């Protein structure tokens, strides 16, 4: 078996390249570490 994809990225989500927290599409900087999406 694999992993049930209930942990998968939802539409428009992005992973912060500084701290790896998963953010929402309307966020332009990370909700945790405040680094800008890059």
Binding site for another protein (CB under 8 A): 1-5, 7-8, 18-22, 31-35
Q: Nearest approach, Cβ of 9 to another protein (angstroms)? A: 10
Is there binding between residue 27 and Zn ion (CB under 5 A)? no
Return d(Cα 34, Cα 11) in angstroms, integer: 21
Nearer to another protein, 1 or 26 (CB): 1
Q: Is-contact 7 15, C-beta < 8 A? A: no
Task: Provide, rounded to whole angstroms, the least separation between the CB of residue 14 and Zn ion.
Answer: 10
Which residue in 21, 19, 27 sits closest to 9, CA to CA? 21
């Amino acid at each position: 078996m694999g992993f049930e994809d209930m942990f998968a990225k939802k539409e428009g989500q992005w992973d912060c390249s500084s701290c790896l927290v998963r953010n929402e599409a309307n966020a332009t900087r990370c909700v945790a570490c405040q680094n800008p999406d890059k």
